[PDB]
Amino acid sequence: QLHVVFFPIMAHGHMIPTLDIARLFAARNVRATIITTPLNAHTFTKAIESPTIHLELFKFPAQDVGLPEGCENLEQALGSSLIEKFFKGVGLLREQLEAYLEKTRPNCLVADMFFPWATDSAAKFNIPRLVFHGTSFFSLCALEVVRLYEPHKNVSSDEELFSLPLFPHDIKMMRLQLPEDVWKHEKAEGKTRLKLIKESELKSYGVIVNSFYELEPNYAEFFRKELGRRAWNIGPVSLCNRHECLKWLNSKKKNSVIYICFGSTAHQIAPQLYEIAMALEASGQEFIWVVRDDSWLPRGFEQRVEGKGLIIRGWAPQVLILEHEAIGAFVTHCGWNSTLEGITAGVPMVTWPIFAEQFYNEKLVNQILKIGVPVGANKWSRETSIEDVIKKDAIEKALREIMVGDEAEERRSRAKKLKEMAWKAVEEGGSSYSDLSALIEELRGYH
Ligand SMILES: O=c1ccn([C@@H]2O[C@H](COP(=O)(O)OP(=O)(O)O[C@H]3O[C@H](CO)[C@@H](O)[C@H](O)[C@H]3F)[C@@H](O)[C@H]2O)c(=O)[nH]1
Ligand SMILES: [K+]
């Protein structure tokens, strides 16, 4: 039996899709083991609830890097200090990884993009290593093209626009949409980490990508041809698996409710929430709003919008909501897992990128896929300063445009097209089904 070990970084947005990939492999009679840490194991245990996914717990050296003992997850490492400590900590997992690989000798290692050294670690035992990023072909390409060509240095002001080189679409961006650790005050740590991450894509056996060919064929090709990567598109992997707010939505018109949610880990301050609430009231749209009370809500808000607006404070069933008939739009931060869920439900999106690769995802959604509307946020930042809050006016304009604005029904039509393409890609005979079959056969044949 083939054995593949999966090693995601301790972040919810990488762990859940990695589990789905493990399940996809398992359903093909492949032995799948996921490496995690003790305080993160509960995520996998809950989502396991079918072939057996095995877990292996590594000790996370929080004390050695000066982190609180309870900080085993990227989401809890808030601030440059804590984040650099977190990445030093995860780099220190290399010894446990090499011990586990020597002990078990699996046929393949699928390792998170944040572990470039994992390539060499697997090479010590002649094991091929695959990179998993968890984002779109487009972001992979655009990030690599920006790193290589640095078109942000041909610019005089923060909002001066430049095109992305080589791309078959003209994509205009400003250096505000890039991290200041690249264009303003160059800090060698992040630059080196990025260099090594992007290099691992060519030094390794190849890249697994959570996308489907028909979604972004130009960039599925660009990644392989112009950028030289060996890759397999096997997404959306969440389709492998396939209530109060639902009963609420049942009595609503089809495609009439806006869903607002900013991802698994939301760092969101009271002034921003207050602007969102005011914009929601002014827009008149029915809505489900997922929040992490007079400190951020207008007086009488929840009662003044009762029956029309619903605030969810806990973990929301995002997929069940998005695919309910009543939901017509999605205000999102453009994380790739949420973006892909919006696409798979066929739901247009208001794009509100914050950090990471989300501005590239926003360009993919708005300019290329033509299923979204920008809210107007254009400043890359880990934490939000009060000086950067998006005001209620832009939010209301975007909420209006996404529901009844120009092309809204066409966006719905395009998204339903993408929805059918997504479901077809993963069914037997589909592009993603076939690429997964091909990857597994190649792994069987290795040496
Ligand atoms: O109330 C809730 C709130 C969330 N969820 C689920 O959590 C997921 C949110 O994923 P999303 O990509 O938007 O945020 P996150 O995964 O942290 O993004 C990082 O990881 C991504 C993957 O690399 C990356 O693209 C991104 O830039 C990073 F920020 C998504 O699968 C939802 O279904 C829910 O079910 N109920
Ligand atoms: K090249």
Residue numbers in the entry: 7 to 55, 62 to 254, 271 to 320, 330 to 484
From the paper:
PaGT3, a uridine diphosphate glycosyltransferase (UGT) from Phytolacca americana, is known for its ability to glycosylate capsaicinoids and other phenolic compounds. PaGT3 adopts a GT-B-fold structure that is highly conserved among UGTs. However, the acceptor-binding pocket in PaGT3 is hydrophobic and large, and is surrounded by longer loops.
The crystal structure of PaGT3 with the sugar-donor analogue UDP-2FGlc was determined at 2.20 Å resolution. UDP-2FGlc occupies the sugar-donor binding cavities in all three PaGT3 crystal structures. The loops Cys289–Ile297 and Val412–Lys429 shift towards the pocket in the substrate-bound structures compared with the apo PaGT3 structure. In the substrate-bound PaGT3 structures, the indole moiety of Trp352 flips ∼180° to form a π-stacking interaction with the uracil ring of the sugar-donor analogue. Similarly, the side chain of His370 rotates ∼120° to form a hydrogen bond to the O3A atom on the α-phosphate moiety of UDP-2FGlc. His18, Gly19 and Glu87 stabilize the sugar-donor analogue through water-mediated hydrogen bonds.
